[PDB]
From a paper:
Trx is a small redox-active protein (∼12 kDa), which has a conserved CxxC catalytic site that undergoes reversible oxidation/reduction of both cysteine residues whereas TR is a member of the flavoprotein family of pyridine nucleotide disulfide oxidoreductases and functions in a homodimeric form. A third TR named DvTRi (i for isolated) was identified in Desulfovibrio vulgaris Hildenborough (DvH).
The crystal structure of oxidized DvTRi was solved at 2.0 Å resolution, with one physiological homodimer per asymmetric unit. Each monomer is composed of a FAD-binding domain (residues 1–109 and 231–309) and a pseudo NADPH-binding domain (residues 119–225) linked by an interdomain hinge region (residues 110–118 and 226–230). The FAD protein environment is well conserved in DvTRi with a similar binding mode, through a network of supramolecular interaction involving structural water molecules and the conserved binding-motifs GxGxxG, ATG and GxFAAGD. In the pseudo NADPH-binding domain, the signature motifs VxxxHRRDxxRA and GGGxxAxE required for NADPH binding are replaced with the VxxxTQGKxxSI and the GEGxxAxN motifs, respectively. However, it is not sufficient to stabilize the phosphate group of NADPH since its binding requires seven salt bridges with three arginines in EcTrxR. The absence of crucial residues in DvTRi required for the binding of NADPH excludes the possibility for the enzyme to physiologically use this reductant, which is in complete agreement with our biochemical data. Whatever the crystallization conditions were, the different structures we solved from crystals 1 or 2 showed an unexpected unique conformation of DvTRi, that differs from both FO and FR conformations observed in EcTrxB structures. The structure revealed that the two active-site cysteines (the CxxC motif) are far away from FAD.
Residue numbers in the entry: 3 to 298
């Protein structure tokens, strides 16, 4: 089992990776280019008296982490679960892997579902965590909302509870890879790009209303838009939330041992300067955690 995985390759995850790798801990970082990493002027990050682009600042962060031995991977994470037993099981598009300690640095970027009355059906049909709520919809007709590999994997997990699963990409282009498409086809899980306008049903969800005015029956709607997010991981790990953010103490510890959180996903002042300090503090906490708990 690896001692440490960092999920996130923005300022928080990279600042943390620099510190952990310098302390001699084999460091594996998962993440892709953050949203800030484009042609945007950064002018308020300490130490840069001349304008630097987000793309270039992040690129220097990456070279900095690699300089001290951090390995950076572009793999998207699909799920995080407590391992059986001990440490954490990390689901990626490529397969599985495992880690003794996790630093969550996945930011707050989120594809939104775009359903006018979705809030009316929270707890009554609309769910998020499959391991959490899947059993309640066993044998039932369940729709997964989302366009990506995350949606595809959530749909496949749902098969543990019901054979009656399909995916709606909510008007978006699907970005499901051919390997996942194969798996969906083999399982009889259909994918279409219809757009759900609203939900219907009187004690609970029973009908999806498409922007057409056409309808489909479903008693379960699992939201899985875009990429798996900090909230999605929180649901499966049992990490306590603070509104839409992860709860973290001043040392970036969550309520789950071995799980730390840093950057935008702990939501205060959503800035590079802030993320870089949280990443550093998370690293310090992880390093001492690993020394007591994870031999390597
Ligand atoms: C255009 C733009 C301009 C900005 N301008 C400024 C500015 O001038 N000054 C300033 O201080 N701040 C600015 N910000 C805000 C600043 O970028 C953020 O506060 C900062 O990047 C937070 O860093 P982070 O590491 O917490 O998250 P992010 O930068 O969002 O990075 C999150 C990381 O998580 C990874 N990730 C997420 N989900 C997964 C997954 N499922 N699997 C694998 N990896 C995943 C992402 O790929 C990314 O690598 C700007 C942001 C944007 C977008
Ligand atoms: Cl700056
Ligand atoms: Cl143990
Ligand atoms: Cl209702
Ligand atoms: Na924060």
């Amino acid at each position: 089992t690896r001692p440490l995985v960092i999920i996130g390759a923005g300022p928080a995850g990279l600042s943390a990776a620099v510190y952990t790798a310098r302390a001699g801990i084999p460091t594996l970082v998962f993440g892709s280019a953050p949203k800030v990493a484009g042609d945007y002027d950064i002018d308020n990050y300490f130490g840069f008296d001349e304008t630097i682009t987000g793309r270039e600042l992040i690129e220097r962060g990456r070279r900095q982490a690699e300089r001290f031995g951090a390995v950076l991977r572009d793999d998207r994470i699909l799920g995080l679960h407590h391992g059986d037993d001990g440490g954490f099981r990390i689901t990626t598009e490529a397969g599985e892997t495992a880690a003794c300690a996790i630093i969550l640095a996945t930011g707050v970027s989120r594809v939104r579902p775009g359903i006018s009355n979705i809030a009316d059906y929270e707890g009554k049909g609309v769910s998020y965590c499959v391991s959490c709520d899947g059993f309640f919809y066993r044998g039932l007709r369940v729709k997964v909302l989302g366009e990506g590999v995350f949606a595809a994997n959530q749909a496949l997990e749902l098969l543990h509870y019901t054979p009656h699963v399909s995916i709606c990409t909510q008007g978006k282009a699907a970005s499901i890879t051919p390997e996942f498409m194969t798996r969906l086809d083999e399982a009889g899980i259909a994918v279409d790009d219809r757009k759900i306008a609203s939900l219907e049903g009187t004690p609970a969800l029973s009908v999806l209303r498409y922007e057409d005015g056409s309808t489909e029956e479903a008693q379960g709607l699992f939201i899985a838009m875009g990429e798996a997010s900090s909230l999605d991981f929180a649901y499966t790990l049992g990490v306590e939330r603070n509104g839409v953010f992860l709860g973290a103490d001043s040392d970036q510890r969550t309520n789950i041992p071995g799980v730390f959180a840093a950057g935008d996903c702990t939501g205060g002042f959503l800035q590079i300067a802030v993320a870089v300090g949280e990443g550093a503090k998370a690293a310090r906490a992880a390093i001492s955690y690993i020394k007591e708990e994870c031999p390597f």
